Design a protein around this ligand. Sequence first.
Ligand SMILES: Cc1cc2nc3c(=O)[nH]c(=O)nc-3n(C[C@H](O)[C@H](O)[C@H](O)COP(=O)(O)O)c2cc1C
Length: 167
Amino acid sequence: MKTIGIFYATLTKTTVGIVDEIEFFLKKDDFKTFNVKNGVKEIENFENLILVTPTYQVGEAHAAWMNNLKKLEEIDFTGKVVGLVGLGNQFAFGESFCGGIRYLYDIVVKKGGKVVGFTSTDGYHYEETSIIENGKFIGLALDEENQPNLTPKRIGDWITEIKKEFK
Ligand SMILES: Cc1cc2nc3c(=O)[nH]c(=O)nc-3n(C[C@H](O)[C@H](O)[C@H](O)COP(=O)(O)O)c2cc1C
């Protein structure tokens, strides 16, 4: 399996614990981890990607991702296999839960990438959503406020699934 590039951002550090969990499930696999507050340049260097963002400002990604969306779109994603992870709060944001991964998704598929790791919408409460395609969420959706006890298995199952598609 080619080395996995893990890219995240965080405001209040919740995402740091989620990244640590991803890294734990990749304990036997080569990965490298980057905080996109330091830019997105290195996304170019990996064939396998895990892009992680908490949700801010009505369904947006963290500002460090938003500020780099033009740079991200400059990257050629052809032949890359990408899993997306959002963190959000589904009851406080009934219309924008984990909406940040939509900004990443649209760029990855536009630039030739393959997005993997769609997840079931069962077990979530939402009034509206912008992160569904084909009846599933376009990535892994985590809610540490309301469903922290589901996060470890949600991540472990997801990592098992996307590793089957990874190069
Ligand atoms: C100002 C603010 C806006 C937020 N907006 C959303 C949102 O639109 N959708 C969502 O699902 N969660 C939203 N959240 C919840 C966060 O995404 C969630 O608490 C996450 O765990 C924060 O991760 P972090 O500690 O790594 O920054 C918001 C939180 C704050 C403080």
